[PDB]
Design a protein around this nucleic acid. Structure first.
Ligand SMILES: [K+]
Ligand SMILES: [K+]
Ligand SMILES: [K+]
Ligand SMILES: [K+]
Ligand SMILES: [K+]
Ligand SMILES: [K+]
Ligand SMILES: [K+]
Ligand SMILES: [Mg+2]
Ligand SMILES: [Mg+2]
Ligand SMILES: [Mg+2]
Ligand SMILES: [Mg+2]
Ligand SMILES: [Mg+2]
Ligand SMILES: [Mg+2]
Ligand SMILES: [Mg+2]
Ligand SMILES: [Mg+2]
Ligand SMILES: [Mg+2]
Ligand SMILES: [Mg+2]
Ligand SMILES: [Mg+2]
Ligand SMILES: [Mg+2]
Ligand SMILES: [Mg+2]
Ligand SMILES: [Mg+2]
Ligand SMILES: [Mg+2]
Ligand SMILES: [Mg+2]
Ligand SMILES: [Mg+2]
Ligand SMILES: [Mg+2]
Ligand SMILES: [Mg+2]
Ligand SMILES: [Mg+2]
Ligand SMILES: [Mg+2]
Ligand SMILES: [Mg+2]
Ligand SMILES: [Mg+2]
Ligand SMILES: [Mg+2]
Ligand SMILES: [Mg+2]
Ligand SMILES: [Mg+2]
Ligand SMILES: [Mg+2]
Ligand SMILES: [Mg+2]
Ligand SMILES: [Mg+2]
Ligand SMILES: [Mg+2]
Ligand SMILES: [Mg+2]
Ligand SMILES: [Mg+2]
Ligand SMILES: [Mg+2]
Ligand SMILES: [Mg+2]
Ligand SMILES: [Mg+2]
Ligand SMILES: [Mg+2]
Ligand SMILES: [Mg+2]
Ligand SMILES: [Mg+2]
Ligand SMILES: [Mg+2]
Ligand SMILES: [Mg+2]
Ligand SMILES: [Mg+2]
Ligand SMILES: [Mg+2]
Ligand SMILES: [Mg+2]
Ligand SMILES: [Mg+2]
Ligand SMILES: [Mg+2]
Ligand SMILES: [Mg+2]
Ligand SMILES: [Mg+2]
Ligand SMILES: [Mg+2]
Ligand SMILES: [Mg+2]
Ligand SMILES: [Mg+2]
Ligand SMILES: [Mg+2]
Ligand SMILES: [Mg+2]
Ligand SMILES: [Mg+2]
Ligand SMILES: [Mg+2]
Ligand SMILES: [Mg+2]
Ligand SMILES: [Mg+2]
Lengths: 142, 129, 150
RNA sequence: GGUGACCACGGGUGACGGGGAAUCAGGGUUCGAUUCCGGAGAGGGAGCCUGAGAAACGGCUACCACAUCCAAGGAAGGCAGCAGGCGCGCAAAUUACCCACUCCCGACCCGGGGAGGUAGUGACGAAAAAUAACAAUACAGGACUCUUUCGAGGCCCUGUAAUUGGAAUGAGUCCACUUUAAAUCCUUUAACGAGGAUCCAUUGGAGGGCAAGUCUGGUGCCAGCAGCCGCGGUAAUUCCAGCUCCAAUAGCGUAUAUUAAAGUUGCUGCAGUUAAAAAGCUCGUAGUUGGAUCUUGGGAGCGGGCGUCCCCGCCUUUACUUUGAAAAAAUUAGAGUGUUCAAAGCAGGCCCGAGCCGCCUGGAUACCGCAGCUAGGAAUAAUGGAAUAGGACCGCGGUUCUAUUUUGUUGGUUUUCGGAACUGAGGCCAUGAUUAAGAGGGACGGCCGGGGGCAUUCGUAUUGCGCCGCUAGAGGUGAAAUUCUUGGACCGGCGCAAGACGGACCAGAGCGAAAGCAUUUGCCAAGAAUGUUUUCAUUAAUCAAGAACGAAAGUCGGAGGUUCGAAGACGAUCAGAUACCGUCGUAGUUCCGACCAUAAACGAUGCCGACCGGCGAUGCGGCGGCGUUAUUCCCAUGACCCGCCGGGCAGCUUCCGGGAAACCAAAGUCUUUGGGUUCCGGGGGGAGUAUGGUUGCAAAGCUGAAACUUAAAGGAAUUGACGGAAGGG
RNA sequence: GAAGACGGUCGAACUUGACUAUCUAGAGGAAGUAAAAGUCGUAACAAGGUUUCCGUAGGUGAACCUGCGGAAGGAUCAUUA
RNA sequence: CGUAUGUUCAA
């Protein structure tokens, strides 16, 4: 069992320090590799340029074509796949547009049936996807 | 090896108490054991006990009254200040209505309520309820 | 249990409660202490000296008859061994095991037992050095230890 | 020399430090660039002048980077001050007014201050708070009483851009007035200003978790939704819509860091037989932990709160505990106080009559860890005093040294004087050593064991060979064939040679730290247990580093090579058969010497210690006891029988108790949670992979990540189904 | 008493080299992961049709097969003087 | 003696 002597504060402190590296929640935030590898670089959002529109096949047991875009982030040049939510929102997006991208809500993990997509589009052409979807504003037509 | 005679004694009393025995043999015996037993006697949790002299550490035979729920030792003997005594009571005793924490203080070995009255903190020995 | 074995044996001596000398012992404290001197001078270890006194002279505990332990009696008379008997016997065993290994180098068991024996020697010698019984720099030299014992 | 496993040195830091912030059972986790204090820097370094004070940058000099002007000779620069621009980004305001406040500098009551104040932008965040209210008619409905139960009357209440009706008001606009340095907003006021009071509340959701439709239309595993489970394949409670309803509300949704939830980092307080996990095993230094034992019944008054009880007492080690001092403010808790309430602020309140010098106040308090300091306590834990007495204490005799004094006309003092050393003889102390641990070491005694090493001996079998006999087959298999064979195979007999192996006896038996260990005899050293009125006296437990041993396979050098047999060859089998089957057969298997360090190295279960039910055995040791048998009688000793004790391998039973259960007398003595200590797990993968280090002849061993991916993977047990499983039909 | 100079000191900076940290290009090579309806076999799950699994070693399209030692998490808690 | 296999989702 664990040591309990009155002079074991160092041993108990040292052991908890070592064993704290063995849960991925701590090692993700305290190693630095995760932050370096993070496409957003520790940011909640990131801007980028739509390289192309791509369709992702939904995982079994579902069947659908999830609409996404390949985006190259401005701040670091990394390439990510961002899901485009809602029914006809992919039509608003065109090639080589500035898009504000956010996370999918699972802190760096895929959400639902879309395989390997960890990001979603919030604004396109500096106008919100929701306001476009709800008819508040229109794709900056020049 | 045996690092704590008091731990061995209190565990032996606890096991015989749960088994419904009327008497328990305690070996070896120490002043700390006898003073601890006396604190339980003054509160009625155990009956008379007879220390037996063997020109050695000593053996004891305790008469059990079927009143102990648990007599446990605390290792190591943490230093207990008066302010921290309440947080020890909430952690070691089933309620404040009964049960005692045995402290070794400069004044002497005593329960937690007598220590509060004498305004002396000390090192914790064990508890019973 | 044993420090260098899995055994948990209990065999030992149970000393009686009564420390007083019995009435049937006609041997006085001095007379017993002079008999100790003959046996130690004859080359017997304190351990052995107690057996001859207990087996044939009725002296159950020299300490009870004389008030002093045998080794403590021998120290006063100057007959005490240079090396403590327990340490001496562990060194003697190590020499015998090491003699066996020189001619039986395939005896991996004897190699294992020797490490245990030398471990007990160092634990014992560490204790004697602390209580200042052995010089502050006594070291067991397996090469030169054969001359000390037998 | 100094520093280091009590972590030095080196590296990292999305590190300025603290007061503090968020979260809150207790313990704790995270944040602290940021208005207060401390520090540091002014594009990067360096060097300086002046000055009390600077290594100053709204000082200078040089260099470096960048950059401006030029007539090309030169000259000039520093916003991490306030604005403002650009760039970067997910990400942050006016090139506004003022010294009135607050305070600072100066020769100074007078000047100045982008310090600071004021307004602007401002859904960062916080506080207060509209978006109606009422009355009657109406229609259901309750409601209150009576009555044929029905029914009726008045009355209270609710749904209706119901039918209305006229009351009220502030958002708004807008005189003045106040505010203020000047303004502003707020506060007040006059005017005006509400019926669809269109002066029109949103954002999310409506299968579950989780409050709210199985309404209607559209689509048809598409489009989409969906944090998770899941919805959608032509009647979708989930998509897209309409209607309705629900949640919060001037605010809601989403992303991301972090906290609780997480006893999912466990000190409190988790796990490690089977779910993830105890190192193959042992030794061992740091570390951690460590048996018992030294003044306790103690005059009370220190009662009758009656006691042969009491709170009260009076028969200078270290940790610890109690106390006192000092510990910025703000923040936090908290007292007072109608900011109108409130977040806030530190104000306010009484008395009108004279303010004759108005009075009456408040501007608390607590916490400030650790260390340090102070004064008590003396249990607990550690440590020390006499053992070659080099001992405590009391006086005694000497050999010495030095200041003051004890002689005030000097000096010599007649000096004495006390202290500090060395030294001798004494007396005296009850003279001085706790115990001997169901802790350990060691001695001895008689045993005991497939424990280890060396040598030796025997056994039959397998294979080969020689001779002899008879004979045509033998072998092998599911069937075969490869194969051996009248050159006589196989089989039978005799004999020889080699190498391996040690059957049966052989057990839920023994021994060893594990790995492992079995023919006889000899030799060598070792070991547990038991027995002991022997000895030592805490010498111990566990263990980072470190070290010995470590099946099999594998590797290196030498010897040997029967048997088996990776590889290989072949014959079968088969759709194929690189296999299972068969015939051969290399390495190896064997001995010696050097490596290797891994196994389902398993009891998948660390070690040491204590306690907790019963029963029959069993092996070792000892003790006791009818009887049987041999030892010819005796004696003891063996074989057997009946018990006991101790150490061990186990077994049965049990509602000890535990556990998810299987089960476990330990895997129990655990929310009634703490004997000591080592290793080690934190969803499944990626992966024991990459990479660096290290070891190795090699094979590899050890140490050991990350990116990314995923909503299960897994344990135990249940019911079914299935089985080229069994049993009965 | 100015310019100026020998020497000393502090010493930016520049060149060269060394060490180190991070990022990054790369023919080719060799992995891993994901993905509604690909090809070859059938290795594991029942005695999975050769019980399975561990270590080690060799071999083969691929799962795997084979040798040697081990485990039962087995398909046996048991086999009789 | 001797044989292998059974497209995706769906109660
Ligand atoms: K001013
Ligand atoms: K709907
Ligand atoms: K708790
Ligand atoms: K023959
Ligand atoms: K037994
Ligand atoms: K089943
Ligand atoms: K499907
Ligand atoms: Mg976690
Ligand atoms: Mg699919
Ligand atoms: Mg579906
Ligand atoms: Mg999923
Ligand atoms: Mg022994
Ligand atoms: Mg040990
Ligand atoms: Mg013994
Ligand atoms: Mg920094
Ligand atoms: Mg910080
Ligand atoms: Mg700060
Ligand atoms: Mg910063
Ligand atoms: Mg500051
Ligand atoms: Mg400065
Ligand atoms: Mg700058
Ligand atoms: Mg400067
Ligand atoms: Mg400036
Ligand atoms: Mg300045
Ligand atoms: Mg600026
Ligand atoms: Mg002025
Ligand atoms: Mg409105
Ligand atoms: Mg829901
Ligand atoms: Mg509901
Ligand atoms: Mg339809
Ligand atoms: Mg857990
Ligand atoms: Mg496991
Ligand atoms: Mg183990
Ligand atoms: Mg140690
Ligand atoms: Mg103790
Ligand atoms: Mg407050
Ligand atoms: Mg045999
Ligand atoms: Mg090690
Ligand atoms: Mg070795
Ligand atoms: Mg081997
Ligand atoms: Mg070999
Ligand atoms: Mg060889
Ligand atoms: Mg073939
Ligand atoms: Mg063969
Ligand atoms: Mg291993
Ligand atoms: Mg294991
Ligand atoms: Mg050990
Ligand atoms: Mg035995
Ligand atoms: Mg626990
Ligand atoms: Mg994991
Ligand atoms: Mg490596
Ligand atoms: Mg799923
Ligand atoms: Mg498993
Ligand atoms: Mg197989
Ligand atoms: Mg198969
Ligand atoms: Mg098989
Ligand atoms: Mg199987
Ligand atoms: Mg092959
Ligand atoms: Mg093969
Ligand atoms: Mg197929
Ligand atoms: Mg098919
Ligand atoms: Mg199928
Ligand atoms: Mg169906």
């Amino acid at each position: 069992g664990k040591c309990r002597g009155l002079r074991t504060a160092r041993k108990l402190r040292s052991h908890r320090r070592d064993q704290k590296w063995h849960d991925k929640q701590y090692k993700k935030a305290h190693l630095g590799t995760a932050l370096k590898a993070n496409p957003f670089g520790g940011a909640s959002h990131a801007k980028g340029i739509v390289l192309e529109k791509v369709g992702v096949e939904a995982k079994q047991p579902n069947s659908a074509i999830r609409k996404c875009v390949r985006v190259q982030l401005i701040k670091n040049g990394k390439k990510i796949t961002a899901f485009v939510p809602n029914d006809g929102c992919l039509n608003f997006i065109e090639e080589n547009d500035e898009v504000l991208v956010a996370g999918f809500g699972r802190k760096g993990h895929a959400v639902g049936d879309i395989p390997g997509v960890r990001f979603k589009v919030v604004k396109v052409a500096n106008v919100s996807l929701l306001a476009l979807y709800k008819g508040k504003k229109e794709r900056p037509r020049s | 090896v045996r690092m704590n005679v008091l731990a061995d004694a209190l565990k032996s009393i606890n096991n015989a108490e749960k088994r419904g025995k009327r008497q328990v043999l305690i070996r070896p015996c120490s002043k700390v054991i006898v003073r601890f037993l006396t604190v339980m006697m003054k509160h009625g949790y155990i009956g008379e006990f007879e220390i037996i002299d063997d020109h050695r550490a000593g053996k004891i035979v305790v008469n059990l009254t079927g009143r102990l729920n648990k007599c446990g030792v605390i290792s190591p003997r943490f230093d207990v200040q008066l302010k921290d005594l309440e947080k020890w009571q909430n952690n070691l005793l089933p309620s404040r209505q009964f049960g005692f924490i045995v402290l070794t203080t400069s004044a002497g070995i005593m329960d937690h309520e007598e220590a509060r009255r004498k305004h002396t903190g000390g090192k914790i020995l064990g508890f019973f309820f | 249990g044993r420090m260098h074995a899995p055994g948990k044996g209990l065999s030992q001596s149970a000393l009686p409660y009564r420390r007083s000398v019995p009435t049937w012992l006609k041997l006085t404290s001095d007379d017993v202490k002079e008999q100790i001197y003959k046996l130690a001078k004859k080359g017997l270890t304190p351990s052995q000296i107690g057996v001859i006194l207990r087996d044939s002279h009725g002296v159950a505990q020299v300490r009870f008859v004389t008030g002093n332990k045998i080794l403590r009696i021998l120290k006063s008379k100057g007959l005490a061994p240079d090396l403590p008997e327990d340490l001496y016997h562990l060194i003697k065993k190590a020499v015998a095991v090491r003699k066996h290994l020189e001619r039986n180098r395939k005896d991996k068991d004897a190699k294992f037992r020797l490490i245990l024996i030398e471990s007990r020697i160092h634990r014992l010698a560490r204790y004697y050095k602390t209580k200042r019984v052995l010089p502050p720099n006594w070291k067991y030299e397996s090469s030169t230890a054969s001359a000390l014992v037998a």
